């Protein structure tokens, strides 16, 4: 007999038609639309489509409540703990309501969704308690606008609300149009938990309401959902100064080596067929099986698939529930109808809201379906010959979120895991989640991390605000001919090169004296620099010891020319340059120091083993330097970036380019490998959009303005972006290390 929904129905009846939860109170129901149980077609409740005025009021209430909420972290901790206690007390109600609203099996809702939501609040309460003492250099961002998908309604809510509240922010959150009910129940327990009025605001509606929230006067936007919508959100927030995190697409590859525990790998896959829907950090949808075991693996997988029970989601014996909505059923049907490759195996005939577990096997490594978007309870599979080929297939995508690797050999499993492009890799498991273990994407899977200490940075700002120096116009001057050869070039791929466009501008000092000429770089020069960075990919695999040695050489070699660099700075700016040179040397030595000291973090989890939140390079970074600090600005951004294993191309100070061109000889003398540091000079209006747009750059740092253009263009490949503030006079090294790294969490067996 299925679980009783009587208490869920009673709550829905008490709530009647829903308005919104704004300023601690329930508003009048407005423009109502039915929310439907997908398993039965029956209307569960009427829910409102929020108006622009509703969003405005929600944001105004969050803004009003934020200063007093921010003031006492211990008080926030008690509230987060109370919320966790209420989720636990009402766990059966939350679980039944989630099944009624979304269609998922009640067994998943009770055993996974609700317990993980509870633990997220329990765990994050402690971050509120410790923020003042352990993060004293950090402060809240303010108001967060948050948008979540329909696949895990309550758990997605927890992943958004818990860290935001812990760090002293208030929230305006919209649940997915199809699944509002558990978010409304969460709203309904906020008063009992002591959530002060306006600290949590929940508004309901379609994507138009999501766009209203994203474009509202919020300090942070956090979104989980499709990559296509993430691009639109990046564009709609470009130039606003908003903090932005995106958890996007990329259902993960599942690599099964010849020496895997076959039966366990099969069981983890079958247990994930229902889970791996919508946008969530998961693995198993793309199956990569080594040739030697492929036939036995598929035979076992089909047999285990046949045992999955499809039906009434309120029955705790059911494994496969109802599809969330008829539009999602149509998506899966259409995907199947459009595919012509492979062999299709389904355990049942599709009937009503129930789509059967489906395996599409026999695909080639380059088939469209291995890389195309997947809908429904569907797995696609291919084979591989060698572990190196598995890595190649797994990484042959625009995505990089979660992945799973199966092997019984301790050496092979730990060799494969770090080579996968991903923010999460599970060894001998899949879909393992904990509040202490960060998760998030690289590439087109987005950016930012949710969970752990690592997730808190994205909900905070520096406690002491820095300000980027104002732009400086280049000096003008006479323009007489130069009979000497004083025309500086570009530095690309370990050698000087002429600008592709052939042009240079005269550089004058503060009194109008001609100092020399500097090249005007173009998009072709940038293309050449990116090619050089691609050739230097081995730098991203060097040891920290080696990178430290190089940075020490750079510092020593600049020190040997310190007087000369101070003189060049004074020639260009009219101000003594000794202090800027000393600071630049210091930045190099601090970056050298950090190159082998920026440690990953080991997470104890209440699951099997440990989660290793590793630090890895971002990859290739294009950087635009400020006008001020002609040497220190360049060195301050270059040095931490290469210390962390990235390759960089920097557009030097537009106004004062000749300190950076003098720096070419320092790079050469220091044996900086070709392509690790490339330097362009010239007009940042020519370079900002090409650098932010470039599909082969992993991050763009624009510290000379053009923030809107840079952030909008970054949506092409969803590269990370940083547009300041950046004050070169201040030591930003540690903060820059975070801009210069990604967190990759590897889950490993561990006997403690």
Ligand X SMILES: CC(=O)Oc1ccc([N+](=O)[O-])cc1
211 annotated ligand binder = yes
Say how far apart CA 172 and CA 605 lie, in whole Å: 30
Of ligand X, a second copy, none, which one does residue 232 interact with (CB within 5 to 8 Å by kind)? ligand X
CB atoms within 10 A of CB 689: 17
Q: Which is nearer to a second copy, 74 or 228 (CB)?
A: 74
Nearest approach, Cβ of 233 to ligand X (angstroms)?
A: 5
622 near 701, Cβ under 8 Å? yes
327 annotated ligand binder = yes
Tell me the longest C-alpha to C-alpha distance in the chain.
95
Say how far apart CA 71 and CA 520 lie, in whole Å: 50
Nearest approach, Cβ of 445 to ligand X (angstroms)?
A: 16
Of ligand X, a second copy, none, which one does residue 233 interact with (CB within 5 to 8 Å by kind)? ligand X
623 annotated ligand binder = no
Q: Which is nearer to ligand X, 211 or 312 (CB)?
A: 211
Backbone angles phi, psi at 142, to 5 degrees: 135, -110
Of a second copy, ligand X, none, which one does residue 735 interact with (CB within 5 to 8 Å by kind)? none
Q: Which is nearer to a second copy, 354 or 539 (CB)?
A: 539
Q: Give the bridge partners for 165, in sequence order.
A: none
Of ligand X, a second copy, none, which one does residue 402 interact with (CB within 5 to 8 Å by kind)? none
Of ligand X, a second copy, none, which one does residue 410 interact with (CB within 5 to 8 Å by kind)? a second copy
Q: Give the bridge partners for 678, in sequence order.
A: 649
The position carrying tokens 């303005």 is 705
Q: Which is nearer to a second copy, 137 or 306 (CB)?
A: 137
Of a second copy, ligand X, none, which one does residue 281 interact with (CB within 5 to 8 Å by kind)? none
174 annotated ligand binder = yes
Q: Give the bridge partners for 144, in sequence order.
A: 171, 220
Say how far apart CA 264 and CA 612 lie, in whole Å: 22
Q: Which is nearer to ligand X, 210 or 452 (CB)?
A: 210
Say how far apart CA 670 and CA 713 lie, in whole Å: 35
3-state secondary structure of 654: coil
Nearest approach, Cβ of 245 to ligand X (angstroms)?
A: 14
Of a second copy, ligand X, none, which one does residue 599 interact with (CB within 5 to 8 Å by kind)? a second copy
Q: Is the peptide bond before 725 cis (omega within 30 degrees of 0)?
A: yes
Query: What residue ranges bind a second copy (CB under 8 A)?
Result: 74, 77-78, 81, 119, 122-123, 125-127, 129-130, 133-134, 407-411, 413-419, 427-428, 436, 453, 541, 543-546, 548-549, 552, 586, 589-590, 592-597, 599-606, 609-610, 612-616, 731, 733-734, 748-752
3-state secondary structure of 273: coil
Say how far apart CA 285 and CA 431 lie, in whole Å: 11
Q: Give the bridge partners for 450, in sequence order.
A: 439
3-state secondary structure of 575: coil
Nearest approach, Cβ of 142 to ligand X (angstroms)?
A: 18
The distance of Cα 103 from the centroid of its chain, to the nearest Å, equals 28
Question: What is the DSSP annotation of 438-497?
Answer: -B--SGGGEE--BSTGGGTGGGEEESSPP-PPPP-PPPP-------S--B--EEETTEEE
Query: What residue ranges bind ligand X (CB under 6 A)?
Result: 147, 207, 210-211, 214-215, 225, 229, 232-233, 236
First to last CA, the chain: 39
Q: Give the bridge partners for 320, in sequence order.
A: 310
Q: Which is nearer to a second copy, 104 or 119 (CB)?
A: 119
Nearest approach, Cβ of 321 to a second copy (angstroms)?
A: 28
Nearest approach, Cβ of 555 to a second copy (angstroms)?
A: 9
Tokens representing 1?
Answer: 């007999």
Nearest approach, Cβ of 471 to ligand X (angstroms)?
A: 30
Q: Which is nearer to a second copy, 239 or 600 (CB)?
A: 600
Q: Which is nearer to a second copy, 118 or 522 (CB)?
A: 118
Residues annotated in a binding site for NAD(+): 148, 150, 174, 177, 211, 226, 279
Residues annotated in a binding site: 148, 150, 174, 177, 211, 226, 232, 279, 327, 331
Residues annotated in a binding site for NADH: 148, 150, 174, 177, 211, 226, 232, 327, 331
């Amino acid at each position: 007999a299925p679980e009783s929904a009587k208490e869920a129905y009673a709550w829905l009846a008490e709530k009647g038609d829903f308005g919104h939860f704004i300023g601690g109170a329930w508003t009048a129901p407005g423009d109502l639309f039915a929310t439907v149980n997908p398993a039965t077609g029956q209307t569960l409740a009427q829910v409102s489509q929020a108006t622009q005025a509703d969003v405005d009021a929600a944001v105004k209430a969050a803004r009003k409540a934020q200063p007093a909420w921010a003031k006492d972290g211990a008080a926030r901790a008690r509230v987060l703990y109370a919320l966790a206690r209420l989720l636990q007390k009402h766990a059966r109600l939350f679980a039944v309501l989630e099944t009624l609203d979304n269609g998922k099996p009640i067994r998943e809702a009770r055993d996974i969704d609700v317990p993980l939501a509870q633990r997220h609040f329990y765990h994050h309460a402690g971050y509120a308690q410790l923020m003042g003492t352990e993060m004293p250099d950090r402060a809240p961002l303010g108001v967060c606008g948050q948008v979540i998908p329909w696949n895990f309604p309550l758990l997605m809510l927890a992943w958004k609300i818990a860290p935001a509240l812990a760090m002293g922010n208030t929230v305006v959150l919209k649940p997915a149009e199809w699944t509002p009910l558990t978010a409304l129940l969460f709203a309904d327990i906020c008063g009992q938990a002591g959530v002060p009025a306006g600290v949590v605001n929940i508004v309901t509606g379609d994507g138009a309401v999501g766009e209203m929230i994203v474009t509202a006067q919020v300090d942070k936007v956090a979104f989980t959902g499709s990559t296509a919508v993430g691009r639109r959100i990046r564009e709609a927030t470009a130039g606003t100064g908003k903090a932005l995190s995106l958890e996007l697409g990329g259902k993960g590859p599942y690599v099964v080596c010849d020496d895997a525990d076959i039966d366990s790998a099969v069981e983890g896959l079958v247990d994930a067929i229902w889970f791996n829907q919508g946008q969530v950090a998961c693995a198993g949808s793309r199956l990569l099986v080594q040739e030697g075991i492929a036939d036995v693996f598929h035979a076992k997988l089909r047999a285990r698939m046949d045992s999955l029970r499809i039906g009434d989601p309120l029955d705790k014996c059911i494994d496969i529930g109802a599809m969330v909505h008829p539009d999602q059923l149509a998506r899966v049907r259409d995907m199947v109808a459009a595919n012509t490759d492979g062999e299709v195996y389904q355990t049942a005939v599709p009937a009503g809201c129930y789509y059967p577990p489906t395996l599409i096997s026999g695909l080639a490594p380059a088939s469209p379906l291995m890389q195309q978007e997947i809908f429904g309870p569907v797995l696609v599979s291919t084979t591989f010959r060698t572990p190196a080929e598995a890595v190649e297939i797994a990484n042959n995508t625009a995505y990089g979120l979660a992945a799973s690797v199966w092997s019984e050999n301790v050496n092979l499993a730990l060799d494969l895991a770090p080579k996968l492009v991903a923010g999460i890799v599970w060894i001998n498991g899949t879909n393992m989640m904990d509040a202490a273990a960060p998760f998030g994407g690289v590439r087109e899977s987005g950016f930012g991390r949710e969970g752990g200490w690592e997730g808190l940075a994205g909900y905070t700002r520096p406690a002491i605000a820095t300000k980027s120096p104002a732009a400086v116009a280049a000096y003008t001057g006479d323009g007489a001919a130069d009979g000497l050869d004083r025309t500086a070039k570009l530095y690309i791929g370990g050698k000087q090169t002429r600008p592709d466009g052939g042009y240079s501008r005269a550089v004058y000092g503060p009194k109008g004296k001609l100092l020399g000429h500097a090249s005007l770089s173009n998009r072709k020069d940038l293309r050449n620099a990116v090619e050089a960075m691609n050739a230097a990919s081995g730098w991203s695999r060097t040891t920290g010891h080696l990178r430290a040695q190089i940075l020490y050489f750079i510092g020593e070699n600049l020190s040997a020319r310190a007087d000369e660099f101070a003189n060049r700075i004074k020639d260009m700016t009219g101000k003594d340059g000794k202090a800027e040179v000393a600071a630049s040397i210091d930045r190099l030595f601090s970056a050298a120091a950090w190159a082998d000291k920026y440690d990953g973090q080991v997470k104890g989890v209440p699951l099997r083993g440990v989660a290793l939140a590793m630090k890895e390079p971002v990859g290739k970074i294009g950087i635009l330097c400020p006008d001020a600090a002609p040497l220190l600005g360049l060195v301050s951004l270059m040095a931490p970036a290469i210390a962390m294993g990235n390759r960089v191309t920097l557009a030097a100070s537009e106004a004062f380019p000749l300190a950076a061109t003098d720096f070419y000889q320092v790079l050469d003398t220091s044996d900086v490998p070709a392509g690790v540091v490339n330097i362009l000079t010239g007009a940042h209006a020519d370079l900002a959009e090409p650098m932010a747009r470039h599909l082969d750059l992993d991050a763009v740092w624009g510290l000379s303005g053009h923030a809107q253009v840079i952030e909008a263009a970054s949506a092409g490949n969803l590269k990370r972006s940083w547009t300041g503030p950046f004050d070169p006079a201040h030591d930003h090294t540690r903060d820059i290390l975070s801009h210069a790294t990604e967190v990759k969490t590897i889950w490993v067996p561990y006997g403690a």
